[PDB]
Amino acid sequence: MSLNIITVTLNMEKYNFLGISIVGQSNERGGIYIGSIMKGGAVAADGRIEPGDMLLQVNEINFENMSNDDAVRVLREIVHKPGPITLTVAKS
Ligand SMILES: Cc1ccc(NS(=O)(=O)c2ccc(CNC(=O)c3n[nH]c4ccccc34)c(Cl)c2)c(C(=O)O)c1
Numbered sequence: 001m002s003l004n005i006i007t008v009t010l011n012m013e014k015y016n017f018l019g020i021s022i023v024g025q026s027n028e029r030g031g032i033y034i035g036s037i038m039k040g041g042a043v044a045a046d047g048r049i050e051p052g053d054m055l056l057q058v059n060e061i062n063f064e065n066m067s068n069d070d071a072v073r074v075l076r077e078i079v080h081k082p083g084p085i086t087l088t089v090a091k092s
Contacts, residue, residue: 004091005056008049010042012085018043018075022055027067031055034089042085049089057088 010018019041024033032055034043043049055063061074078085 005088006048006091007086007088008043008046009084009086010046012042012079012083015040015042015045016079017041018079018085020049020075022068022071022075025066025068025071026064027070032063032066032068032071033092043087049087050092052092054090054092055087056090059086 017038017040019038020043021035021038022032023035024031026032034049034051034053034055036051037044037049055071057063058074058078061078063071063074066074
């Protein structure tokens with residue numbers, strides 16, 4: 001019984017996509033998780049992140065109080081723009 005928080009910086013120069021899908025909503029009163037990891041993606045290459053892991057922060061953006069649409073939109077814009085990508089996730 002512990003909380004494991006890992007920071008993973010992805011090789012975005014080699015892989016042009018995260019290859020992940022996010023599920024859930026942190027929007028409602030009272031989180032956002034990795035639904036699935038796609039092969040050929042940066043997240044699959046790193047191997048540390050697994051499905052059911054809670055997504056806390058990407059780069060300088062925090063996913064708290066975010067709807068699924070908004071959360072997907074943040075990720076689209078970050079992947080679209082050139083640069084490195086760093087995820088903070090809480091292991092299930
Ligand atoms: C959640 C998310 C959002 C954006 C992402 N990057 S991306 O903007 O460059 C992106 C966006 C969209 C796709 C493919 N399109 C869809 O997956 C897609 N397009 N419309 C959809 C509706 C429901 C579920 C999926 C989709 C790809 Cl292959 C890559 C990524 C990613 O790079 O893994 C993940």
